[PDB]
Design an enzyme around this catalytic site. Sequence first.
Site, mmCIF file in Angstrom:
data_model
loop_
_atom_site.group_PDB
_atom_site.id
_atom_site.type_symbol
_atom_site.label_atom_id
_atom_site.label_comp_id
_atom_site.label_asym_id
_atom_site.label_seq_id
_atom_site.Cartn_x
_atom_site.Cartn_y
_atom_site.Cartn_z
ATOM 1 N N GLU D 182 26.113 16.376 95.127
ATOM 2 C CA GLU D 182 27.338 17.065 95.524
ATOM 3 C C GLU D 182 27.542 18.542 95.142
ATOM 4 O O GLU D 182 28.104 18.850 94.082
ATOM 5 C CB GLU D 182 28.568 16.266 95.090
ATOM 6 N N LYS D 224 26.581 15.511 99.664
ATOM 7 C CA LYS D 224 28.019 15.602 99.909
ATOM 8 C C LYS D 224 28.466 17.064 99.783
ATOM 9 O O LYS D 224 28.937 17.491 98.730
ATOM 10 C CB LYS D 224 28.774 14.734 98.900
#
EC number: 4.1.2.13
Lengths: 342, 342, 342, 342
Positions: D182, D224
């Site tokens: 992420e 992400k």
Amino acid sequence: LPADVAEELATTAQKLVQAGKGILAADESTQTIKKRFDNIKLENTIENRASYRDLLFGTKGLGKFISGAILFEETLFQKNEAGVPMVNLLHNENIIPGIKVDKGLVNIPCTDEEKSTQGLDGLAERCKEYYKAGARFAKWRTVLVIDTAKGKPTDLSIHETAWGLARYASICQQNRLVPIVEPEILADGPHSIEVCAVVTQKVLSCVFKALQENGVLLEGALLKPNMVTAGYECTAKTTTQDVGFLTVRTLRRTVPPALPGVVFLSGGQSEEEASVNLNSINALGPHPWALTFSYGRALQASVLNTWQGKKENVAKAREVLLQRAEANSLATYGKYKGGAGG
Amino acid sequence: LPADVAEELATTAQKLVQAGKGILAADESTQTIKKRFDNIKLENTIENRASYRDLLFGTKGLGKFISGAILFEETLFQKNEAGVPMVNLLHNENIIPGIKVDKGLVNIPCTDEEKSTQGLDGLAERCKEYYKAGARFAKWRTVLVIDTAKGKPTDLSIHETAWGLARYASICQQNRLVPIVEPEILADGPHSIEVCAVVTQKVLSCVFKALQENGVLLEGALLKPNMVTAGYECTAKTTTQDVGFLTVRTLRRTVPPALPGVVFLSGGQSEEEASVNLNSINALGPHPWALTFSYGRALQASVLNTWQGKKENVAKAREVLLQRAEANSLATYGKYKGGAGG
Amino acid sequence: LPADVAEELATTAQKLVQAGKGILAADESTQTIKKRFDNIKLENTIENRASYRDLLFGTKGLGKFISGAILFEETLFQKNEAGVPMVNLLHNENIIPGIKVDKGLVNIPCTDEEKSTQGLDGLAERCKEYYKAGARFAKWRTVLVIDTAKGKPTDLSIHETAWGLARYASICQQNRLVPIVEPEILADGPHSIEVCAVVTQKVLSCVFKALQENGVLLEGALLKPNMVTAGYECTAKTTTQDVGFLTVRTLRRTVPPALPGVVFLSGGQSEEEASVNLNSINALGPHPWALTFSYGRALQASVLNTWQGKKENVAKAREVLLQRAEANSLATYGKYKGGAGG
Amino acid sequence: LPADVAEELATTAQKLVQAGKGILAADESTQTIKKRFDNIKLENTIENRASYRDLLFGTKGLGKFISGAILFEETLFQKNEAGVPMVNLLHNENIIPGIKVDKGLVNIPCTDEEKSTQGLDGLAERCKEYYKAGARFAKWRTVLVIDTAKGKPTDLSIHETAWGLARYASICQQNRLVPIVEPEILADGPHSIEVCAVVTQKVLSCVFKALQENGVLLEGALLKPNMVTAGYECTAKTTTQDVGFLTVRTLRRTVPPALPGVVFLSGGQSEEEASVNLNSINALGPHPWALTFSYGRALQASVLNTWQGKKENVAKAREVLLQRAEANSLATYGKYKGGAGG
């Protein structure tokens, strides 16, 4: 980058790898072509070369299997015996003129004779010179070598190749020329097809990173990598399927979708080997980029052979050309069943 | 690298920055020298330059304040009116012949007009050509710029600079030529001296790293960086004490002791300022390397001025050379009291 | 970095390597010290350890040969049998308390079992905890391994070690603690002293580069590298002089003058070997940084030996300690003539 | 990496982004959830959270719109009021249990308050602990910031981010846990969407490079990132069409096809906006990877709102979940017509 030139880049890059078509690399320098000619005992005369390039580019129908032809400086500016400029023969068959723009391989000081590619000096001016000549894409070749024992390719080799190609590519684009980024890793050695995949993956990783750093528009660029194959000395019998798989894997693991296509290089593969392998790659379903060919030797070997310099064999050899051009065209669609020559 | 060439590089590198001596930069290209000559309204003829270079390298006694002189290709192969080869004038005064090997600055595509130094194509052969012609060390100049607002120097600049230099530096060393790694950061802009120190520190760190990556024998090479000064527009009145401190600091923070010495560049500093500063620097106790000079403009300005081309003013001018050349020699020892001109 | 903390860093870093003094590393964890104790068949009780650390730190006169002692967490917060806190025993002899702050070595996934050093998590809080305990400098150890055959140390190992140490060092400084950057390369293997120099040079190059990137104040930091030596298996008889030379060379080639000193690590060298080698290094004239010791085993071996856990031998062993402490102190000045033990 | 674990990672990574499904992020830490609860003026009790998580993971029919749910440690080991283990509620609806493995953000010393994500210490053991407890994939969040003026995100940020992620990602994969890399770039600031694209492109390029350097099997991992949007202060009214184009572009320019899919993050986007955007994205023809969602706030906002803690509103709230969860499911196919709420 000007939206106009950018748009141009993207267009030609995509046109260069359109469905069922590959690129013929006829960019052999006066030195290398001598090597090719020697095999048929041809005199490396300017006339002989002109007759040759004319034989390839004049082949009626070559425009269906070839999207572009990488030309050597000379040929880009010459004409054939009947005064027809070479680039016109290409236009006739709708083939896009390309131009090799690197000044050759030299060694890197403090490495075990690992290459570096000359050309950056003046490249920008030359590019314009070439565009005016009617060229639309360029090529710059680098050579990496695998040698697990001697730790090759060293990081300096990889870094050098990464930055060089990058610099070159950023320049060509500026000058309305699509860059064919060629980081060739030589099959020379006893390394296995697994090592090749590993090394090839590492190199491509570095390459694209450099491209990013320099600002090379991937969408208006092409990659010309070596297929993943065993070393020339590796006795372990690998299959064409391994070649295809391992290659597609390493590519998926490194090449962003922005890159329009990958124009494979035959290297030391035989004409058939290249057709089959290329085929087994495309055979592996839908890929996010074009996986076509940029064959030279793999397209010329028999041509140059059956020709023998004797014009009496020109037509006969022109067929041989289409034979191979079609094989690789079908191989594009995974439709080449081994038969167009062996 | 051969033990012989290594020893040689090490030797001349150390000789080039011996106690009290600096380097005279008279490698001005036909275009740049034109600018210099225009000031004294002198015609940029071949004869005029010949007389000027001759005037400089003829100065009896020059050898005590000058270790080596960076020549331009032309001057490296030419003679003076009396048929005396320019290199011979140098030998006479025991000065070491140097040669500028960079083929000029070009822009980096996709950067706000930031430079890239041409040269690597051929450089190896040219180096031999020059070694024979009596060139012992070489020069390559890179230009970086500080522009906090536009984020300059960009990583691409700093990177290209680092790799370019290192690439050149390794080639030179291969061919018995000590390389003067020149990472010039233009003092242009309102940037403060603090920012200059930071940026310089960064740049040097990156350069020496590339040198390492390429295998540049530090012991047989030299560095010509800018001094740590404020920007041309920085109204903040900074002192020469500051220049000296910051400069010494950023250097201690980046230059390995294996590097023989740092040949400072005047840039846009007035002859006196360059002297004062270089003095303020050396004044800061003993240093692990030689912090000498490699001035050009800060050495020639008054000479060329007082000369006005008129040979009638030759000796009058030569005196001024020795005036400055000595100023800096003392500056080396931190013994220069502002007096040799203003 | 606050000018106050910075000034503090610089001071202690410089005090830590003052003339004729080195650092005693008594930071063995409960595990490692068990190993040490086993050789004398001592029970790894908390009492035994406390008696030991008390034996070292209580040695009257140890303050002349030792500038600081690297302590393990436990010891940093414990007291001896008579309630005297360990750090007070140090203060008594003017020794500076130090603290190992790394949580150990783990492997790097996708490397042939190459280490990574844990500790960053919570380090900042711990640092304050330790400063309050009276600690002024910290240590974090990394382990690199040479194996030309398996290509070790890999770039991932080197990069990991570079960034880790860097991160760690930037944190300690923030918390008023001088960082001892320890990138140890293990002598394990059949590699020669030339390879060691090459690898050691590469690693240090990367290390300092990372330090630059993170903003580690070199002036308030220390380096703890392995001396350049042949692999444990290398039959080629190398001399202490080679050790000294090659070491000093690789250091000059990498360590900027800003770094106050280099506190060598004995690794697998015998107590004498370490004294001699350290001596042969300083023997090589004036160096731009302090080249002292941070010996642990090389200082404890005979101590722990002659002690045997039996307090009846405490004094006897305390002498042995000074014997070695003095050897290495003189070796600092290149004044150690082999004799203080063999 | 073992062929077995590799296959598993690949499997769950692909299952985690199957056609029409996204990931539910309910890994909120005790502190963050407190913030969420405060909005509906609910007490941050253990029971309240238990009821809330239970409400989410109990939603009969949730499995069709949700592939997996990122849990917080607590929730991963807890049960609901009726003694039913939270993971079991998930299994019921065929949802995959995920676990947030990052020990929090910390500042990078010598950067203008830029973060560094803690975790690597222990992470391996914890991963096993979690795998047993039924965790199949993991999460690690990094925070980058755009601030052209202050030159953010600095290279140190981008670097630390890249190496941190890659370090974590490799550990997870070792322990049968698919890592969700992420790299969040906060839309904070007046930066334009064009700048967001540029910075994001850069950041991703650097991340995937570190992943390569560490050996993170792309095929068994997921990313992400933030979507390409304008800054919170950018008065320039940009369209969702733009968001979709730019985002798709920067991704094609950086993400290798070997990466299963991209699980977008809502950030500060309104539930509807996140849906619309995610739809505008998928609307852009077929993509080489899955461009699904991994929402948390854009999924829970209305639910938690309409719930007000009052169990009396449980089903009423659950409906809203399915309302949104379906919205995005259709958005996946580019079939979401703005209607499921505003």
